[PDB]
Amino acid sequence: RVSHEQFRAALQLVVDPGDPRSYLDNFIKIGEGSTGIVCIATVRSSGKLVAVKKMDLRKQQRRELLFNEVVIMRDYQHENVVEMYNSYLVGDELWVVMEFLEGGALTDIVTHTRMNEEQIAAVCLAVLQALSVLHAQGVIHRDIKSDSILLTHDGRVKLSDFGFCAQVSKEVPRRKSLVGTPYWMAPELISRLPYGPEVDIWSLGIMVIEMVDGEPPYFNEPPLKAMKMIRDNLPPRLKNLHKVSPSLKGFLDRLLVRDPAQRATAAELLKHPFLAKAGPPASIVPLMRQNRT
Ligand SMILES: Nc1ncnc2c1ncn2[C@@H]1O[C@H](COP(=O)(O)OP(=O)(O)NP(=O)(O)O)[C@@H](O)[C@H]1O
Ligand SMILES: [Mg+2]
Protein backbone atom coordinates (compact mmCIF):
# COMPACT_ATOMS: atom_id res chain seq x y z
CA ARG A 1 0.00 0.00 0.00
CA VAL A 2 1.06 3.56 -0.84
CA SER A 3 -0.46 4.41 2.57
CA HIS A 4 1.73 2.03 4.60
CA GLU A 5 5.06 2.77 2.94
CA GLN A 6 4.66 6.56 3.04
CA PHE A 7 3.76 6.42 6.74
CA ARG A 8 6.61 3.99 7.47
CA ALA A 9 9.21 6.25 5.83
CA ALA A 10 7.87 9.35 7.60
CA LEU A 11 8.04 7.67 11.00
CA GLN A 12 11.56 6.46 10.15
CA LEU A 13 12.74 10.09 9.95
CA VAL A 14 11.02 10.99 13.24
CA VAL A 15 12.49 8.16 15.37
CA ASP A 16 16.13 7.49 16.30
CA PRO A 17 18.10 5.30 13.87
CA GLY A 18 19.04 1.65 14.45
CA ASP A 19 17.79 -1.27 16.54
CA PRO A 20 17.74 -1.21 20.38
CA ARG A 21 18.52 -4.96 20.53
CA SER A 22 22.13 -3.82 20.06
CA TYR A 23 22.04 -2.66 23.70
CA LEU A 24 19.00 -4.43 25.22
CA ASP A 25 18.43 -7.96 26.54
CA ASN A 26 15.63 -10.12 27.94
CA PHE A 27 12.51 -8.81 26.21
CA ILE A 28 9.58 -10.27 28.17
CA LYS A 29 5.97 -9.14 27.71
CA ILE A 30 4.49 -7.56 30.85
CA GLY A 31 1.11 -6.39 29.54
CA GLU A 32 -0.81 -5.18 26.51
CA GLY A 33 -2.90 -2.18 25.51
CA SER A 34 -5.00 -1.12 22.53
CA THR A 35 -2.04 0.07 20.43
CA GLY A 36 0.34 -2.82 21.14
CA ILE A 37 2.25 -4.71 23.82
CA VAL A 38 4.62 -3.54 26.58
CA CYS A 39 7.63 -5.53 27.76
CA ILE A 40 10.56 -5.07 30.13
CA ALA A 41 14.15 -5.35 28.96
CA THR A 42 17.64 -5.03 30.44
CA VAL A 43 20.49 -2.73 29.46
CA ARG A 44 23.46 -4.94 28.52
CA SER A 45 26.18 -2.97 30.33
CA SER A 46 24.16 -1.30 33.10
CA GLY A 47 21.95 -4.28 33.97
CA LYS A 48 19.21 -1.69 34.44
CA LEU A 49 15.53 -2.29 33.69
CA VAL A 50 13.60 -0.35 31.05
CA ALA A 51 10.15 -0.68 29.45
CA VAL A 52 9.60 -1.10 25.72
CA LYS A 53 6.29 -0.41 24.00
CA LYS A 54 5.93 -2.25 20.71
CA MET A 55 3.30 -1.10 18.20
CA ASP A 56 2.57 -2.62 14.79
CA LEU A 57 1.91 -0.02 12.08
CA ARG A 58 -0.30 -2.41 10.08
CA LYS A 59 -2.52 -3.07 13.12
CA GLN A 60 -3.61 0.46 14.11
CA GLN A 61 -7.02 2.14 14.33
CA ARG A 62 -5.79 5.53 13.12
CA ARG A 63 -2.12 5.12 12.16
CA GLU A 64 -1.18 8.82 12.44
CA LEU A 65 -1.85 8.76 16.20
CA LEU A 66 1.48 6.92 16.57
CA PHE A 67 3.35 10.21 16.15
CA ASN A 68 2.06 11.21 19.60
CA GLU A 69 3.68 8.15 21.15
CA VAL A 70 7.09 9.59 20.22
CA VAL A 71 6.61 13.36 20.10
CA ILE A 72 4.60 14.05 23.29
CA MET A 73 7.03 12.32 25.69
CA ARG A 74 10.02 13.86 23.87
CA ASP A 75 8.73 17.45 23.99
CA TYR A 76 7.20 17.40 27.48
CA GLN A 77 10.02 16.39 29.81
CA HIS A 78 8.30 16.71 33.20
CA GLU A 79 8.38 15.50 36.80
CA ASN A 80 4.92 13.92 36.36
CA VAL A 81 5.45 12.60 32.82
CA VAL A 82 6.93 9.18 31.92
CA GLU A 83 10.52 9.54 30.68
CA MET A 84 11.15 8.43 27.11
CA TYR A 85 14.74 7.45 26.39
CA ASN A 86 14.51 6.55 22.71
CA SER A 87 12.24 5.49 19.88
CA TYR A 88 13.16 3.06 17.13
CA LEU A 89 11.63 1.48 14.06
CA VAL A 90 12.11 -2.29 14.09
CA GLY A 91 10.71 -3.87 10.93
CA ASP A 92 7.01 -2.98 10.84
CA GLU A 93 6.90 -2.04 14.53
CA LEU A 94 7.49 1.14 16.48
CA TRP A 95 9.52 0.59 19.66
CA VAL A 96 9.54 3.17 22.39
CA VAL A 97 12.20 2.73 25.06
CA MET A 98 10.87 4.40 28.19
CA GLU A 99 11.45 4.20 31.95
CA PHE A 100 9.99 1.15 33.65
CA LEU A 101 7.44 2.17 36.28
CA GLU A 102 7.86 -0.23 39.20
CA GLY A 103 4.64 0.68 41.04
CA GLY A 104 2.23 -0.32 38.26
CA ALA A 105 -0.98 1.43 37.23
CA LEU A 106 -3.44 3.25 39.52
CA THR A 107 -6.20 0.84 38.41
CA ASP A 108 -4.60 -1.91 40.51
CA ILE A 109 -5.03 0.27 43.62
CA VAL A 110 -8.53 1.74 43.12
CA THR A 111 -10.06 -1.65 42.24
CA HIS A 112 -8.81 -3.22 45.49
CA THR A 113 -8.51 -0.68 48.29
CA ARG A 114 -9.99 2.66 49.31
CA MET A 115 -7.59 5.60 49.25
CA ASN A 116 -7.85 8.39 51.81
CA GLU A 117 -8.08 12.08 50.84
CA GLU A 118 -4.38 12.62 51.57
CA GLN A 119 -3.55 10.01 48.90
CA ILE A 120 -6.28 11.09 46.45
CA ALA A 121 -5.09 14.71 46.58
CA ALA A 122 -1.50 13.58 45.93
CA VAL A 123 -2.60 11.81 42.72
CA CYS A 124 -4.69 14.78 41.52
CA LEU A 125 -1.84 17.22 42.13
CA ALA A 126 0.55 15.08 40.08
CA VAL A 127 -1.90 14.78 37.18
CA LEU A 128 -2.91 18.45 37.23
CA GLN A 129 0.72 19.54 37.19
CA ALA A 130 1.21 17.35 34.10
CA LEU A 131 -1.99 18.60 32.42
CA SER A 132 -1.33 22.30 33.05
CA VAL A 133 1.89 21.97 31.04
CA LEU A 134 0.05 20.10 28.25
CA HIS A 135 -2.94 22.47 28.12
CA ALA A 136 -0.56 25.44 28.11
CA GLN A 137 0.71 24.19 24.72
CA GLY A 138 -2.85 23.43 23.58
CA VAL A 139 -2.38 19.66 23.91
CA ILE A 140 -5.36 17.55 24.98
CA HIS A 141 -4.65 14.08 26.41
CA ARG A 142 -8.13 12.69 25.66
CA ASP A 143 -7.56 9.44 27.61
CA ILE A 144 -7.47 10.35 31.32
CA LYS A 145 -8.27 7.37 33.56
CA SER A 146 -6.66 5.31 36.35
CA ASP A 147 -5.13 3.05 33.69
CA SER A 148 -3.14 6.02 32.34
CA ILE A 149 -1.55 6.82 35.70
CA LEU A 150 1.61 4.91 36.61
CA LEU A 151 3.57 4.83 39.88
CA THR A 152 7.18 4.47 41.01
CA HIS A 153 8.43 2.20 43.82
CA ASP A 154 8.79 5.27 46.03
CA GLY A 155 5.23 6.50 45.43
CA ARG A 156 5.76 9.15 42.76
CA VAL A 157 2.96 9.55 40.21
CA LYS A 158 3.40 9.90 36.43
CA LEU A 159 1.07 10.34 33.47
CA SER A 160 1.27 7.95 30.50
CA ASP A 161 -0.74 6.80 27.43
CA PHE A 162 -0.23 9.82 25.16
CA GLY A 163 -1.29 7.91 22.02
CA PHE A 164 -4.63 9.74 21.88
CA CYS A 165 -3.27 13.29 22.20
CA ALA A 166 -4.47 16.09 19.93
CA GLN A 167 -3.40 19.71 19.55
CA VAL A 168 -5.54 22.83 19.40
CA SER A 169 -4.20 26.26 18.44
CA LYS A 170 -5.46 29.73 17.57
CA GLU A 171 -6.17 28.41 14.06
CA VAL A 172 -7.91 25.16 15.06
CA PRO A 173 -9.45 26.05 18.45
CA ARG A 174 -11.40 22.81 18.96
CA ARG A 175 -11.18 19.12 18.13
CA LYS A 176 -14.18 17.06 16.99
CA SER A 177 -12.95 13.46 16.68
CA LEU A 178 -14.41 10.82 18.98
CA VAL A 179 -11.58 9.30 21.05
CA GLY A 180 -11.14 8.05 24.63
CA THR A 181 -12.67 5.33 26.80
CA PRO A 182 -16.53 5.45 26.96
CA TYR A 183 -16.99 5.99 30.73
CA TRP A 184 -14.35 8.72 31.11
CA MET A 185 -15.65 10.65 28.10
CA ALA A 186 -16.92 14.22 28.54
CA PRO A 187 -20.60 14.97 27.67
CA GLU A 188 -19.81 17.58 24.99
CA LEU A 189 -17.39 15.12 23.37
CA ILE A 190 -20.02 12.34 23.29
CA SER A 191 -22.47 14.81 21.70
CA ARG A 192 -19.89 15.20 18.89
CA LEU A 193 -19.53 18.94 19.59
CA PRO A 194 -16.30 20.90 19.02
CA TYR A 195 -14.27 20.51 22.21
CA GLY A 196 -11.07 21.79 23.84
CA PRO A 197 -8.79 20.77 26.76
CA GLU A 198 -11.80 20.93 29.09
CA VAL A 199 -12.56 17.27 28.27
CA ASP A 200 -9.49 16.22 30.27
CA ILE A 201 -10.74 18.02 33.38
CA TRP A 202 -14.00 16.06 33.15
CA SER A 203 -12.15 12.77 32.76
CA LEU A 204 -10.12 13.60 35.87
CA GLY A 205 -13.47 14.12 37.59
CA ILE A 206 -14.45 10.58 36.63
CA MET A 207 -11.06 9.35 37.91
CA VAL A 208 -11.86 10.92 41.30
CA ILE A 209 -15.07 8.86 41.42
CA GLU A 210 -12.77 5.92 40.63
CA MET A 211 -10.57 6.73 43.64
CA VAL A 212 -13.53 7.25 45.97
CA ASP A 213 -16.17 4.76 44.76
CA GLY A 214 -13.88 2.28 42.94
CA GLU A 215 -15.75 2.52 39.63
CA PRO A 216 -16.47 5.14 37.01
CA PRO A 217 -20.25 5.79 36.91
CA TYR A 218 -22.32 3.30 34.84
CA PHE A 219 -19.34 0.88 34.69
CA ASN A 220 -21.68 -2.11 34.99
CA GLU A 221 -23.58 -0.92 31.88
CA PRO A 222 -22.53 -1.67 28.25
CA PRO A 223 -20.12 0.98 26.83
CA LEU A 224 -22.59 2.32 24.22
CA LYS A 225 -25.56 2.73 26.58
CA ALA A 226 -23.33 4.26 29.26
CA MET A 227 -22.30 7.09 26.91
CA LYS A 228 -25.97 7.94 26.28
CA MET A 229 -26.48 8.25 30.05
CA ILE A 230 -23.49 10.59 30.39
CA ARG A 231 -24.83 12.62 27.45
CA ASP A 232 -28.37 12.85 28.89
CA ASN A 233 -28.16 12.94 32.70
CA LEU A 234 -26.89 15.53 35.20
CA PRO A 235 -23.23 15.42 36.33
CA PRO A 236 -22.66 12.18 38.28
CA ARG A 237 -22.46 12.47 42.07
CA LEU A 238 -20.58 10.48 44.72
CA LYS A 239 -22.56 7.64 46.31
CA ASN A 240 -22.69 9.23 49.76
CA LEU A 241 -20.94 12.42 50.79
CA HIS A 242 -21.26 11.61 54.50
CA LYS A 243 -17.55 10.86 54.82
CA VAL A 244 -16.28 13.14 52.03
CA SER A 245 -14.83 16.45 53.26
CA PRO A 246 -16.32 19.62 51.68
CA SER A 247 -12.84 20.37 50.35
CA LEU A 248 -12.99 17.34 48.02
CA LYS A 249 -16.71 17.80 47.34
CA GLY A 250 -16.23 21.43 46.25
CA PHE A 251 -13.16 20.36 44.24
CA LEU A 252 -15.07 17.65 42.38
CA ASP A 253 -17.89 20.12 41.70
CA ARG A 254 -15.41 22.20 39.68
CA LEU A 255 -14.35 19.13 37.68
CA LEU A 256 -17.70 17.61 36.77
CA VAL A 257 -19.34 20.75 35.34
CA ARG A 258 -21.60 19.98 32.37
CA ASP A 259 -20.98 23.26 30.52
CA PRO A 260 -17.30 23.26 29.37
CA ALA A 261 -17.13 27.06 29.77
CA GLN A 262 -18.02 26.89 33.49
CA ARG A 263 -15.67 23.95 34.08
CA ALA A 264 -12.37 24.77 35.79
CA THR A 265 -8.97 24.72 34.07
CA ALA A 266 -5.82 22.90 35.23
CA ALA A 267 -4.16 26.28 35.94
CA GLU A 268 -7.08 27.28 38.20
CA LEU A 269 -7.40 23.89 39.90
CA LEU A 270 -3.71 23.85 40.84
CA LYS A 271 -4.63 26.48 43.44
CA HIS A 272 -7.66 24.68 44.90
CA PRO A 273 -7.47 24.33 48.71
CA PHE A 274 -8.02 20.56 48.33
CA LEU A 275 -4.64 19.91 46.71
CA ALA A 276 -2.89 21.26 49.82
CA LYS A 277 -4.00 18.03 51.53
CA ALA A 278 -1.67 16.10 49.19
CA GLY A 279 0.67 13.81 51.12
CA PRO A 280 4.30 12.92 50.32
CA PRO A 281 5.07 10.12 47.82
CA ALA A 282 5.72 7.93 50.90
CA SER A 283 2.02 8.04 51.85
CA ILE A 284 1.18 6.26 48.58
CA VAL A 285 3.62 3.36 49.12
CA PRO A 286 1.25 1.47 51.50
CA LEU A 287 -1.36 1.33 48.70
CA MET A 288 0.85 -0.61 46.27
CA ARG A 289 0.55 -4.36 45.59
CA GLN A 290 3.68 -5.42 47.50
CA ASN A 291 2.50 -3.70 50.70
CA ARG A 292 -0.93 -5.34 50.99
CA THR A 293 -2.02 -8.39 53.02
N1 LIG B 1 6.55 2.59 31.48
C1 LIG B 1 5.80 1.56 31.96
N2 LIG B 1 6.21 0.83 33.02
C2 LIG B 1 5.47 -0.19 33.49
N3 LIG B 1 4.28 -0.57 32.96
C3 LIG B 1 3.76 0.08 31.90
C4 LIG B 1 4.51 1.21 31.32
N4 LIG B 1 3.79 1.67 30.29
C5 LIG B 1 2.67 0.90 30.21
N5 LIG B 1 2.65 -0.05 31.16
C6 LIG B 1 1.56 -1.06 31.37
O1 LIG B 1 1.20 -1.70 30.14
C7 LIG B 1 -0.22 -1.83 30.02
C8 LIG B 1 -0.71 -1.55 28.60
O2 LIG B 1 0.01 -0.48 27.99
P1 LIG B 1 -0.71 0.91 27.57
O3 LIG B 1 0.39 1.93 27.40
O4 LIG B 1 -1.85 1.19 28.51
O5 LIG B 1 -1.32 0.59 26.11
P2 LIG B 1 -2.51 1.49 25.49
O6 LIG B 1 -3.77 1.18 26.27
O7 LIG B 1 -2.53 1.23 24.00
N6 LIG B 1 -2.12 3.19 25.73
P3 LIG B 1 -2.57 4.39 24.53
O8 LIG B 1 -3.23 3.59 23.44
O9 LIG B 1 -1.27 5.03 24.11
O10 LIG B 1 -3.50 5.33 25.26
C9 LIG B 1 -0.84 -0.86 31.02
O11 LIG B 1 -1.85 -1.51 31.81
C10 LIG B 1 0.31 -0.35 31.88
O12 LIG B 1 0.10 -0.63 33.27
MG1 LIG C 1 -3.76 0.35 28.58
Side-chain angles (χ1 to χ4, degrees):
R1 289 163 199 162
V2 183
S3 275
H4 176 251
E5 304 287 73
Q6 189 164 88
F7 179 74
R8 217 215 111 113
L11 199 65
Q12 176 64 79
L13 306 157
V14 173
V15 305
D16 305 304
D19 192 310
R21 289 175 297 186
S22 73
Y23 70 94
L24 297 176
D25 285 315
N26 304 306
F27 286 77
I28 302 110
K29 188 207 270 202
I30 57 156
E32 59 183 325
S34 43
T35 46
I37 61 105
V38 171
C39 31
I40 50 92
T42 48
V43 187
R44 195 109 46 196
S45 51
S46 188
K48 202 208 169 63
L49 266 38
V50 295
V52 174
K53 195 167 190 182
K54 299 179 181 171
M55 293 149 290
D56 191 344
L57 283 68
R58 293 158 294 149
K59 292 187 174 186
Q60 297 304 310
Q61 270 273 66
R62 211 209 297 183
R63 49 153 51 103
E64 53 267 36
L65 291 173
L66 291 182
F67 287 122
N68 296 320
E69 220 91 49
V70 178
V71 169
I72 302 304
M73 281 185 188
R74 183 155 67 197
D75 295 357
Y76 302 90
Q77 208 99 49
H78 193 260
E79 172 195 35
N80 307 107
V81 173
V82 180
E83 289 198 2
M84 188 202 78
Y85 302 122
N86 292 109
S87 50
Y88 305 94
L89 197 63
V90 179
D92 287 309
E93 285 176 352
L94 170 66
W95 290 16
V96 180
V97 193
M98 69 193 85
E99 57 152 296
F100 169 61
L101 277 142
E102 323 87 54
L106 186 73
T107 325
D108 180 272
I109 300 169
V110 297
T111 52
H112 290 82
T113 57
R114 288 205 309 272
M115 297 161 71
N116 60 30
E117 296 190 11
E118 181 200 32
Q119 293 152 344
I120 290 170
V123 169
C124 296
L125 176 55
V127 180
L128 277 165
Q129 279 173 351
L131 281 172
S132 62
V133 171
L134 285 170
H135 293 193
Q137 302 311 296
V139 176
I140 321 164
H141 187 276
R142 294 152 102 213
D143 204 22
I144 294 293
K145 57 175 183 288
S146 61
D147 315 55
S148 306
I149 321 294
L150 305 173
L151 315 188
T152 70
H153 71 281
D154 54 302
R156 277 177 290 110
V157 175
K158 303 201 182 188
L159 182 66
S160 192
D161 299 352
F162 299 107
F164 291 96
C165 285
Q167 193 172 342
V168 291
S169 70
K170 288 159 187 180
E171 332 299 310
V172 55
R174 306 265 169 247
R175 308 303 296 193
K176 49 196 71 181
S177 324
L178 186 76
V179 310
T181 30
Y183 312 95
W184 292 266
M185 272 168 151
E188 71 271 26
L189 192 145
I190 297 160
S191 303
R192 287 180 293 175
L193 267 50
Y195 63 86
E198 311 85 37
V199 298
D200 279 337
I201 305 303
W202 175 275
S203 296
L204 181 64
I206 304 297
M207 199 186 77
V208 170
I209 301 184
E210 265 193 294
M211 289 183 276
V212 177
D213 293 352
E215 281 180 35
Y218 323 108
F219 197 57
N220 48 349
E221 312 299 311
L224 311 164
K225 296 293 157 71
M227 293 187 294
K228 275 163 75 81
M229 288 177 162
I230 306 155
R231 189 199 65 204
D232 293 15
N233 300 119
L234 299 88
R237 304 156 78 252
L238 291 167
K239 280 175 181 171
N240 60 339
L241 311 98
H242 181 61
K243 283 200 163 176
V244 183
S245 79
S247 192
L248 209 183
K249 184 256 191 163
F251 175 85
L252 188 62
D253 287 335
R254 297 294 300 116
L255 267 53
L256 297 171
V257 187
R258 217 182 199 289
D259 195 359
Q262 309 310 313
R263 203 177 300 154
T265 57
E268 293 170 7
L269 288 158
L270 279 166
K271 284 175 279 178
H272 198 287
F274 170 69
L275 297 187
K277 296 193 171 195
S283 76
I284 284 167
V285 174
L287 299 167
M288 286 184 281
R289 197 147 205 85
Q290 193 183 6
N291 302 47
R292 273 142 57 192
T293 306

